[PDB]
């Protein structure tokens, strides 16, 4: 049946964007990278993880 074009696309729920102030970009983005990756020691446990799931 060709009528199922984007069938799941229609069945998907409706979720809207969440309010969030814009992240600084430019040299601030490079600055933001440094302050949370290398000098920061929060995630250095076994592999220097940076997007870990809820454990």
């Amino acid at each position: 049946s060709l009528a199922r074009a984007g069938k799941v696309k229609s069945q998907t729920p409706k979720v809207e964007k969440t309010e969030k102030p814009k992240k600084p970009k430019g040299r601030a983005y490079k600055r933001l990278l440094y302050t949370r990756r290398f000098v920061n020691v929060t995630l250095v446990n076994g592999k220097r993880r940076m997007n870990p799931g809820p454990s």
């Binding site: 430019g26 490079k30 600055r31 990278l33 440094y34 990756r37 290398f38």
Partner: protein, 184 residues
């Protein structure tokens, strides 16, 4: 009819742009010295590429050749003029040992920090793009000024800026106007 205008790119992307061995060290460099983009730093790699190539085919031949000695003597004069090369090494070997930092700390973005007038590389950018620093007698707007080992004896604050006199400030005057209006 018109004479074509010559142009040439000053940057070159590496053959492998997708690997974790280099992005981390490159992220450190941008954050440390405060560079907005990273097209500039491949430009620096391009800067090292030309001199290394110019040095590579200069040493391929023997000594005492008239063009080789001129190109060698002319070259080493440039690096000692800008300051990326020390004043006690002119053996045409150290011109091949330059690494990425040596052409990057000479940037005006770091000279003001070395003078203690910025207190940070990012605050230095807040003095550069908003014309609050005059590396010479005239104000400039270019972070990559490539000082020539003589600006430090000539560096001074911008004449039409705070800490250089001749004006109190723009928003400082605006705030004074608001205070005067509120007081009255």
């Amino acid at each position: 009819p018109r004479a074509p205008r010559t142009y040439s790119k000053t940057y070159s992307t590496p053959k492998r742009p997708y690997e974790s061995s280099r992005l981390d060290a490159e992220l450190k460099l941008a954050g440390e010295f405060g560079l907005k983009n990273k097209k500039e730093i491949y430009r620096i790699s391009f800067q090292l590429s030309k001199i290394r190539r110019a040095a590579r085919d200069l040493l391929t031949r023997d000594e005492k050749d008239p063009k080789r000695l001129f190109e060698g003597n002319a070259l080493i004069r440039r690096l000692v003029r800008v300051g990326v090369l020390s004043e006690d090494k002119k053996k045409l070997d150290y011109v091949l040992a330059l690494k990425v930092e040596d052409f990057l700390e000479r940037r005006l973005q770091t000279q003001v920090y070395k003078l203690g007038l910025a207190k940070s590389v990012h605050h230095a950018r807040v003095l550069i793009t908003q014309r609050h620093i005059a590396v010479g007698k005239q104000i400039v707007n270019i972070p990559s000024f490539m000082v020539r080992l003589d600006s430090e004896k000539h560096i001074d604050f911008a004449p039409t800026s705070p800490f250089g006199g001749a004006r109190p400030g723009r928003v400082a005057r605006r705030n004074a106007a608001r205070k005067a209006e509120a007081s009255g």
